[model samples]
Target: RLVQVDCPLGPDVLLLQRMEGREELGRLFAYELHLVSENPNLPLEQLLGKPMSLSLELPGGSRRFFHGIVARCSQVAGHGQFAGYQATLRPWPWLLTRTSDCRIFQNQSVPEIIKQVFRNLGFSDFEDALTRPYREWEYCVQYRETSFDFISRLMEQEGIYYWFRHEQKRHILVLSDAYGAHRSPGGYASVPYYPPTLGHRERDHFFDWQMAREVQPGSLTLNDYDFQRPGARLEVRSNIARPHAAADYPLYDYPGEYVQSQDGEQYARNRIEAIQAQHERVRLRGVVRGIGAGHLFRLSGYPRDDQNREYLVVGAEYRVVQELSQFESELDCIDASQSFRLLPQTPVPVVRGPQTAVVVGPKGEEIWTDQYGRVKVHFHWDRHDQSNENSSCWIRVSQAWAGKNWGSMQIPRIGQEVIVSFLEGDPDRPIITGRVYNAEQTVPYELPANATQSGMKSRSSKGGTPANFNEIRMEDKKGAEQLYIHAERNQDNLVENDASLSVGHDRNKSIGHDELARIGNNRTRAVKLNDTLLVGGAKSDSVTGTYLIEAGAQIRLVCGKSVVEFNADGTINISGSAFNLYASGNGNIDTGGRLDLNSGGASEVDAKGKGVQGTIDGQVQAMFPPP
Candidate 1:
């Protein structure tokens, strides 16, 4: 009698004879099912490329079911007669085989990118079932390749495993970490027999087992010369063995040409631990369920020499046939104690400002890089082991702001002193965090106000008044009243540049020295009402070199009861067509000395007022000359 079998292809026509396959972590799950047709009306050709389901009842009374797609189908012949059809089945991800195209994802995690890839292949049911959250810095897929190749490569790199679960009448694909617990029972399965004999048995079940132990390298040393530092060459040792001078194994091979020192260290540690654990290998053949590859298990029902111990299922195989009505499981196990341990290291205080660096040329040979102004940094290390040759990362030349994007970063110039910082205290990805000033990196200025004391400074509690430092106040505390340029303070404030002083109200300026004012350019000042200037002291005006005064319409000078006269020691000569002397009220001509008047023609003196009065001292003569 055959155990229960499911066939979505048809009725009695699709009877499965034998089904066997293997599914391992970090790999594709595949299986092959043999079938034979009993109905003449329905041929086995209809089963090609069709979906199928299988359920097997093991001798231990455990039931297991699986869903798969018909990946391949072929007909067999025996003695010139058609036998049956054999179909190869694979899990749901097999559907990705039809997808082929180019794709690009940016700033997305690895799990998120994988989900999108599945979504692109018209499979949305399994997109949300992924749980692994590994981050991907950047990823791309080339054209003309199946999506399975792209996703499988990424899954293998990240140590991820995927499987399909048939629940609620739908196939649900699950993605998870390969190293995690993957079996249904969460650990190992129990074997019925210890397999004392290897020959055939008449019983329904039989067992065959094998175990071996070998000497493995207890320590691993990886030489990553790309970054030759004290920690560059990582070493991982197992605690299971004592130090043997010849036990150290040096491995120079890595997956990539160059890997980060930190990453290299981690990979070396994980690889060596995994290899060490496999030193004691175990292989068992029996019938079981709830145990699979990448799962933890235990060995029991053995003699004292083979005591119970935990083991990891590194490989497994399962098969069921119609004639036997029983399924069998074969497992390859390893000691779990040899796996890497997660231990805490001694904490070392990080020194942020312990050392400063200067930008040098390219790391190795090139003069410069095409990546902005990024350059290799040279640190003033007391020991030569602290030096590293890596670049392409830029420094923060500007202290004003910081950006998270690499494109917006500020690259420092060569020979520039910068404050460097290491991410997670790692020197491989050295970052120029900030900048500093030294003798060669001072600010530029024209005037020598405080050349040595200028720029920026940080002082401890030293010398004079500790609080006498220049400060910039902002917001409500700003006390700056005016800004002066090229100003002098010997007498009063002065500016070489053009300046204008405006007073909202009355402005009274008292200058102790001469207040020299000049309008070299041009301006127009207007007083809408009146403008007056009063001199409080006696004022005398004289132009010795040359003087000229003119008025457009009129010129007037007035004096009250004061004599306005012109006197000269030389001869007084006044000539016009007619000379007359008159006073509106009264007129007089008085001279203590002799007075003589001569003109070309007659001279007349008249007073339009009351009368003309004249007084001559000694003698007064009036001479007439020919015209």
Candidate 2:
């Protein structure tokens, strides 16, 4: 019996046991979810060309392969390789084999499974459903009492490679065909490969379909080898390219009766459809009716003769496709925006020409600027939908800088200031441009005016640097406010003033700074640091130089095959999914499916989400420099 295990949030797993074989075995329950359609805002496409997924629970200390096919399977036990098929109650147990046997979902023997799955889905007489229409033909047989006995002699050859080995001997039978042509004049021409007749006037007798009947059973031989050798024996191979006709196959034994069930026709049709859809690449060429799907077809090739001949039977793999996943649609476009406005209200400097510019939003977030340099500016608008809309969204305003009184234009730096009143707009909703810098006497609870131009200096003199940063600032003297200017100059390409500074880029490049100043702290110092640093001395216990990490620090975590320094900054650096620590504080497990805690008597997680897509094992730790 197969049972489904229900989980609070993860996948519903199945627990199946295989009892048909000598050794009882169990199957871990897992399901692969696939989307069946392209309809957005709906459950993911589950059937239409979507890839299925496998879930992993705990950490699996050891590795193993779980998927494959039954070379031969059935509900009833039989001799030889047939015993593997006698299982109608449950799936085959997890068989231990080599890597070559692993049959994951995508690469499984699809054409074969389509046949079985169709049967499982209530199809009977799997073959009839897969049968194809054929063309009738005729052939001739030459009388040869010993030919039968000679054919019998060739059939006696046996051994693993006997299939291939015997084929060589069968080809030699062509000499016999030449004998018949020799008896008739121009008769050898009809036999195609007949050797030149002994005389100019060869016997005029000709061969029709009757001469073709004098044939020998064909066989194959692979890599010249002694066939009868035990371990050296090769499986007998057959040439599907040539099949003896129906007339050639003597009806010595009856095929018994085959009656059609009321549902048999329907079953056949469905089976054919499944076959075509399941297999990835199959070549099917025939006069197909309405039937569709994947299947192993039977076909025959020929050298036509005068008398009617029976058809030859050989395996031809094909697929019958009805629908495909090409119909599914992907995420497309998005148009969204955010804005801020300035009003007449104030406490500090007077508005010069009707406007001044103020930079708001982080470096990249600001889309466009108001060239008038007004106290207000429309933030930004993005038309591209960068994220898949699952739990995805876009934020407009992060914090409420000024909307009430007009006094000191308090500019809040990201991370440094806490957001008060924030708002988010739906991407589908209309864009609503709202108040940004509530400046001037025109608006209440607003701040003083500040221009948005990058190069334009502010309106006054006490300028040394902005309040918090070492950039330019505005100043006032003798009740009169005037903008102060610092002439641009490079001294030996080195900064004269000093302060700690750090710079980084995505691509590698060296950076240096001679002077830096922390305006708010009234501090100045020279700052320099190497690109890469290795802390911690040689001895494990010896005191080593340290690097501090705090919140909001940008860092990359690279875990080598072996261990490095302890990443105490609450960051993880996992090169593989083999981590064995118990989570105590804030930690995220974001690799594959549900976490399995008991693998290898330890914990076994699919690590790769069992077999689902997009799931791999690894983690990165963050490094934050001390503030």
Predicted structure with the largest TM-score when compared to the true one: 1
lDDT of 2 by residue, 1-627 (tens): 121222112223211212211101011112221212122222212212222221112112221111212222223222331121111111111111111111111122222333333343443321221122211111111112122221221111100000000010111011110111111111111212111242222322212111212232232222212212425433222221224453222111111111122122322222222222221221222322111111112212223431122111111221211222011101110100100111111121111211111223334432322222112121122222221221111222222343434333333222121222211211111122232333231322123433321222322222423332222445443465444444343323366787554545443433243434345554443436545433322314432566455534434333333222234465443344565778787877675565655554333222222222222121111122334
Clashing pairs in 1: none
Q: Which tens-of-lDDT digit does each residue in 210-321 have in candidate 1?
A: 7876666665555434332534544332233534355455444433212455555544554565556556667877655556665666667666456466666667788877
Model 1 bad stretches (over 4 Å): 40-45, 58-62, 78-83, 124-133, 139-145, 162-173, 178-180, 184-189, 196-206, 213-247, 253-264, 273-278, 294-296, 304-307, 324-326, 336-627
TM-score, each model?
0.47, 0.14
**Model 2, 530: alpha-carbon shift in Å?**
51
Please give the TM-score that candidate 2 achieves against the real structure. Answer: 0.14
Give the runs in model 2 whose Cα sits over 4 Å from its true position.
1-291, 302-448, 452-471, 474-627
Superposed by TM-score, candidate 1 places the C-alpha of residue 350 at a distance from the truth, in angstroms, of: 39
Candidate 2, backbone clash total: 103
